[PDB]
Design a protein around this ligand. Structure first.
Ligand SMILES: *[C@@H]1O[C@H](CO)[C@@H](O[C@@H]2O[C@H](CO)[C@@H](O[C@@H]3O[C@H](CO)[C@@H](O)[C@H](O)[C@@H]3O)[C@H](O)[C@H]2NC(C)=O)[C@H](O)[C@H]1NC(C)=O
Ligand SMILES: *[C@@H]1O[C@H](CO[C@@H]2O[C@H](CO)[C@@H](O[C@@H]3O[C@H](CO)[C@@H](O)[C@H](O)[C@@H]3O)[C@H](O)[C@H]2NC(C)=O)[C@@H](O)[C@H](O)[C@H]1NC(C)=O
Lengths: 305, 274, 638
């Protein structure tokens, strides 16, 4: 729980952990040992931060740190995803988010379907995995595609090019999955492709064999990357509904016991918490069991089923 | 193996409303989970009704022992009230002196996405219709033909009526080989009244050439009273939106329509017959 | 400044009626809107509006009904956020909902069955008002191993609470304790049980009871233990036969028999006289000290054979206690907190050491003198002791001054009491002490509102608001003015048939603690009523008791009951009670089930006002920020 204060960029850093904690508690049904309506104050501060973010609105129906500064594509996608994930507690602006989605699709995207950013964010802590300038373009495209698919459930009646942009991005990233070096980008690209269902065959090989030790997508520094990639894997498996590899990685997750804290350890925490929330929501208490047991007797004509 | 009678299309990814084995020689049945019977020498009626927010998708009855009689000569299963797409139907099945047992499973799908467009279309509808039978054409005029292996009935001249797996089917009027299938439309239960109409595009590449209708309807008797489906006006090139009205003696439960388009069509199709 | 607060029950049930109370301390017509919406999140369930009346001093006689929702469903339990707004300010609180939507009373026609018969049972689906309600029930019949052999699901819509079901026992079946487990369709954890025998038996022709002249046992008896045999036919006549009597000791999960005390006696005209000598009992065990038998009970197993050698009636009076003192003291219905300065009455429950209440027995104190009382039919005595005004804890024991008895046979037990945490050291308490008598419907109870404030601000308490909590609901509310100069007021409450089995009478009033600051002083007292029916259902014969009934004859039964009630009859032989009298339906069982499911277990007067209401089962919240805790389970701890 951190008080939301600062500029447009700083408000996200201030109020993101409270938002992720509130959603995780809501989905996990573990509110009984958190404070007995501390959610009231948490959501009041969240609404205050939402009003502060709205105060820096731009004519393009997007959001940014400065009123005069052009919005960033990654920042717009992150804001859209965060506001779309919170559509069950408080009222959220509908037309503004749809306009931001249309601006991202029609303007901040090449005709081939590749999204390109022009204004990098001021702060260097919330960038996450984009610090290394090796595969920035396709990583940005995948993140934008994920945010757009997350927001697809509402703004479809206001955007008509969204299915076309999604198809273009998926068909373009299908052929680029074999030319990736860093591991966590491989994981996130696999998750993005599996979101629609374009992760099958040799791609899974790169998810299984190319990964180091089949469970850790480690990189020099930024340990959170690992769990981030971990979460991606779970989501992909949860999209494919496979129980072969999920329990071991879930058990490995609990051995870390990380709850944020540090320099720019916010985006990864949000992604892992939302992945865990989806995991809890989708995974049943058991595995599928539906038997249809019949028997036949040489003395009875009917089949007893 | 057993005699399997089908209403609707089976789906492998859905759940069953219930499943019970019924002794057809019992008088009366056992009320399982709260559903009533009516058993006679010639009839077996199940007044099933569910208490879940879902709509019936299919019904399958398996009769024992297997008796070598074709199922397409007449009709055996039908929901007298309601039917497929509703939450309950009065399911009537006619028995025989040899059949002594039955096994009834009924499937339902969530009422939210209560649609059948994903199962009656198949992969390629261009050559295969909803019945799963291939299309046959004649070289006399390069058009379609007629099938004579299922249950059919006629009332007036040039009237087509087909009944298979609880599906009632009609074609107006005939289809050419070179025509390209465009799309399809569905009608839910909430949009169904005693009389209703449709509006379809008839401009540029969307010129109407051939239409087909598949539906599920109720019966008050073993012999049904077919709805009086007739086209109103002329689907000419001038009127941009063509319309079609339906007059029903018995209330319908589901409706599916497929659209066939050909810009080169003249808007009229009829053989040189009188 | 105008002052506002909320009064709500600690737990509310789905598909029922709940009542909250509002008070204004703000004369004037002010509307209040109460909104119930689900938790977690903000999704609306219900909304009600009501305007207060200055002429009525603004009591909240406002109710709501929680919707019969369906998406409430697994995982951890669920909470509900209840909100109130009197136009200008907002007060909300978290409350717990209960899957225990009601009670299911499964009653079978018998207790023991044979393979090849029919189990007939009725499920009575009541709600927390013991009233018929329509729900859906899932019933399972479990074998003695623990796996169901049949399951069913019925509905109680327009059935008036009676769900009659049946089951056929196969002729090739397993013998033992068969179970019926029925629970509401919405609550899979609300399992109600009914265990019945399946055995290969035959009807006994008489009941034998073995009764002691002294219902306990004493270590230092110089004569022995005398038990007598009453073998009477099930139609109330007298027998002629012989009997075999053996004894034993009821240790931990075992039974030790004494073949030396294997006696045979002639039952002389439905009577026997068996004497167990002390030497035989001493020789039964190998303990040099008899005092080591304290804490263990004996059992007498008798078996009476008729002179015809026909029937075989083995009866056991298990649990004959061996105690130095024949009286045992309890603190079950006595609070664990004492009131300094205020006289602290104690609810004394002295009984025979196996739970049966005593009678005409006094109570004594080590230091106090000349103070004694008497025990009425229920088994509760009364006393009054003045307490130390300081913070010294009080630990006292109950002694007995019964005549014709030795001073070494007086029981004792140390009791721990904790001082109340008065806010601001105001020394302001509350005591709703009631005179202990036999409470009956249609009578008047003179409830006393004991008061102890200071002369500085005693005259500023204009009125007292009392609330009655019965079966976990606010039964009634009321007010009584308190003019200055009065230290005691009496409320002649007309106790009706709706106060059964008990009622927590809690009282609350506002206060200012030493500087312009809001406080609430409140307390509740446990009051129990004699446990008769809420209605009046009796059965008798319409004849004039001319002569005895004869087999095959008709009698015109007379049944007296309510109007619009559905009475179900069951005629069952007492031979099943001979073979197995366990698990029988009685109104006392119904009231015990209610009490075990009641929201309160501690008598009241907790550490603080929040503890006071937690014991009383209430949630108070106001704009000042004062709030109580919450509980998530269904039954009280331990
Ligand atoms: C054998 O039993 C079946 C039922 O299991 C009988 O079928 C039922 O027959 C009755 C009377 O013929 C039909 O009732 C009709 O109801 C309409 C409603 O308006 C009414 O207008 C008609 O005049 C008639 O009373 C009922 O619909 C029918 N049920 C089905 C499912 O067909 C059958 O008649 C019996 N055969 C015998 C007794 O020979
Ligand atoms: C496309 O529309 C065609 C014409 O519409 C029908 O006919 C007349 C116009 O020809 C419509 O208006 C009527 O005009 C009359 C004067 O001729 C008026 O007296 C009358 O009150 C009415 O206003 C009429 O509403 C419309 N329907 C009918 C049933 O007449 C039609 O002929 C074509 O079939 C249609 N194309 C389709 C249906 O595919």
């Amino acid at each position: 729980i951190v008080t939301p204060s600062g500029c447009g960029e700083e408000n996200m850093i201030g109020m993101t952990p409270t938002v992720i904690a509130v959603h995780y508690l809501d989905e996990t049904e573990q509110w009984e040992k958190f404070g007995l309506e501390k959610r009231q104050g948490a959501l009041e501060l969240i609404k205050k931060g939402y009003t502060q973010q709205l105060a820096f609105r731009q004519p393009s129906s997007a959001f940014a740190a400065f009123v005069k500064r052009a919005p960033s594509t990654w920042l717009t996608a992150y804001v859209v995803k965060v506001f779309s994930l919170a559509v069950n507690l408080i009222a959220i602006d509908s037309q503004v988010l749809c306009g931001a989605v249309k601006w991202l699709i029609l303007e901040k995207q090449k005709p081939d379907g590749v999204f390109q950013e022009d204004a990098p964010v001021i702060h260097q802590e919330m960038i996450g995995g984009l610090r290394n300038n090796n595969e920035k373009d396709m990583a940005l495209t995948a993140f934008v595609l994920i945010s757009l698919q997350e927001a697809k459930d509402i703004c479809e009646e206001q955007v008509n090019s969204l299915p076309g942009s999604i198809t273009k991005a998926g068909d373009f990233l299908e052929a680029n999955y074999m030319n990736l070096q860093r591991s966590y980008t491989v994981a996130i690209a696999g998750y993005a492709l599996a979101q629609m269902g374009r992760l099958k065959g040799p791609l899974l090989n790169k998810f299984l064999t190319t990964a180091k030790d089949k469970n850790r997508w480690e990189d020099p520094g930024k340990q959170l990357y690992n769990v981030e990639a971990t979460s991606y894997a779970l989501l992909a498996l949860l999209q494919l509904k496979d129980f072969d590899f999920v329990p071991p990685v879930v058990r490995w997750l609990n051995e870390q016991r990380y709850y944020g804290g540090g320099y720019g350890s916010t985006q990864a925490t949000f992604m892992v918490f939302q992945a865990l929330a989806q995991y809890q929501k989708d995974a049943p208490d058991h595995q599928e069991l539906n038997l249809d047991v019949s028997l036949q007797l040489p003395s009875r004509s009917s089949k007893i089923t | 193996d057993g005699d399997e009678y089908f209403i609707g299309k089976y789906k492998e990814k859905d759940e069953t409303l219930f499943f019970a084995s019924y002794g057809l020689k019992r008088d009366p049945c056992q009320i399982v989970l709260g559903y009533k019977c009516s058993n006679n020498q010639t009839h077996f009626v199940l007044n099933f009704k569910t208490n879940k927010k879902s709509c019936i998708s299919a019904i399958k009855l398996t009769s024992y022992p297997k008796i070598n009689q074709n199922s397409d000569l007449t009709r055996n299963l039908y929901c007298q009230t309601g039917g497929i797409g509703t939450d309950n139907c009065k399911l009537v099945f006619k028995k025989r002196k040899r059949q002594i047992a039955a096994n009834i499973e009924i499937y339902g799908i969530p009422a939210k996405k209560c649609s059948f467009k994903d199962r009656y279309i198949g992969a390629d509808p261009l050559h295969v219709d909803s019945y799963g039978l291939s299309y046959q054409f004649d070289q006399e005029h390069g058009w379609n033909l007629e099938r004579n292996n299922i249950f059919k009935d006629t009332r007036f001249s040039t009237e087509v009526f087909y009944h298979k797996n609880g599906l009632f089917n009609t074609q107006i009027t005939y289809l050419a080989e070179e025509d390209s299938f465009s799309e399809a439309r569905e009608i839910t239960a909430k949009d169904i009244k005693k009389k209703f109409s449709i509006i379809l595009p008839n401009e540029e590449y969307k010129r109407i050439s051939f239409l087909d209708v598949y539906w599920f309807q109720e019966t008050m008797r073993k012999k049904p009273k077919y709805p009086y489906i007739h086209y109103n006006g002329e689907c000419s090139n001038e009127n941009k939106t063509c319309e079609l009205v339906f007059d029903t003696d018995e209330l319908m439960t589901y409706a599916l329509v497929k659209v066939f388009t050909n810009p080169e069509s003249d808007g009229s199709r009829l053989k040189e017959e009188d | 400044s105008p002052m506002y607060s909320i009064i709500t029950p600690n737990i509310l049930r789905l598909e029922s009626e709940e009542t909250m109370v509002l008070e204004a301390h703000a004369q004037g017509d002010v509307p209040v809107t109460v909104t119930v919406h689900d938790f977690p999140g903000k999704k609306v369930l219900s909304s009600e509006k009501t305007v207060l009346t200055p002429a009525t001093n603004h009591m909240g006689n406002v109710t709501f009904t929680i919707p019969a929702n369906r998406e409430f469903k697994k995982g951890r339990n669920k909470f509900v956020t209840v909100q109130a707004t009197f136009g200008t300010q907002v007060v909300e609180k978290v409350v717990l909902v209960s899957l225990q939507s009601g009670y299911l009373f499964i009653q079978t026609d018998k207790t023991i069955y044979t393979p090849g018969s029919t189990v007939l049972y009725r499920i009575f689906t009541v709600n927390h008002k013991l009233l018929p309600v329509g729900r859906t029930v899932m019933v399972n019949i479990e074998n003695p191993e623990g796996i169901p052999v049949k399951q069913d699901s019925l509905s109680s819509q327009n059935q008036l609470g009676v769900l009659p079901l049946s089951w056929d026992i196969p002729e090739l079946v397993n013998m033992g304790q068969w179970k019926i487990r029925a629970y509401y369709e919405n609550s899979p954890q609300q399992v109600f049980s009914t265990e019945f025998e399946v055995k290969e038996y035959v009807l006994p022709s008489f009941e034998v009871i073995v009764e002691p002249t002294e219902k306990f046992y004493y270590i230092y008896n110089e004569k022995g233990l005398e038990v007598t045999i009453t073998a009477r036919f099930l139609y109330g006549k007298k027998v002629e036969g012989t009997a075999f009597v053996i004894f034993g000791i009821q240790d931990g999960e075992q039974r030790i028999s004494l073949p030396e005390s294997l006696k045979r006696i002639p039952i002389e005209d439905g009577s026997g006289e068996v004497v167990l000598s002390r030497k035989v009992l001493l020789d039964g065990v190998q303990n040099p000290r008899a005092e080591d038998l304290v804490g263990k009970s004996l059992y007498v197993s008798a078996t009476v054979i008729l002179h015809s050698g026909s029937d075989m009636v083995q009866a056991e009076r298990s649990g004959i206690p061996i105690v130095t003192s024949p009286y045992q003291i309890h603190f079950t219905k006595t609070p664990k907190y004492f009131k300094p300065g205020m006289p602290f009455d104690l609810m004394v429950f002295v009984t025979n050491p196996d739970g049966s209440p005593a009678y005409r027995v006094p109570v004594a104190v080590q230091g106090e003198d000349t103070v004694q009382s008497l025990t009425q039919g229920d088994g509760v005595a009364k006393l009054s002791i003045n307490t130390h005004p300081s913070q010294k804890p009080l630990s006292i024991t109950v002694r007995t001054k019964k005549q014709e008895l030795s001073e070494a046979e007086q029981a004792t037990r140390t009791m721990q009491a904790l001082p109340y945490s008065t806010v601001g050291n105001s020394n302001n308490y509350l005591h709703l002490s009631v005179l202990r008598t036999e409470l009956r419907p249609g009578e008047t109870l003179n409830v006393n509102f004991l008061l102890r404030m200071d002369r500085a601000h005693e005259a500023k308490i204009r009125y007292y608001t009392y609330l009655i909590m019965n079966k976990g609901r606010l039964l009634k509310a009321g007010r009584q003015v308190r003019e200055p100069g009065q230290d005691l007021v009496v409320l002649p409450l007309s106790i009706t048939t709706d106060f059964i089995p008990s009622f927590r009478l809690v009282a609350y009033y506002t206060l200012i603690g030493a500087s312009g600051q809001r406080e609430v002083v409140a307390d509740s007292v446990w009051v129990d009523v004699k446990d008769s029916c809420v209605g009046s259902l009796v059965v008798k014969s319409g004849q004039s008791e001319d002569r005895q009934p004869v087999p095959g004859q008709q009698m015109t039964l007379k049944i007296e009951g309510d109007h619009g009630a559905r009475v179900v009859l069951v005629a069952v032989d007492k031979g099943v009670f001979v073979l197995n009298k366990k698990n029988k339906l009685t109104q006392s069982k119904i009231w015990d089930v209610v009490e075990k499911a009641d929201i309160g277990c501690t008598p009241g007067s907790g550490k603080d006002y929040a503890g006071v209401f937690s014991d009383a089962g209430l949630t108070f919240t106001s704009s000042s920020g004062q709030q109580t805790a919450q509980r998530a389970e269904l039954q009280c701890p331990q």
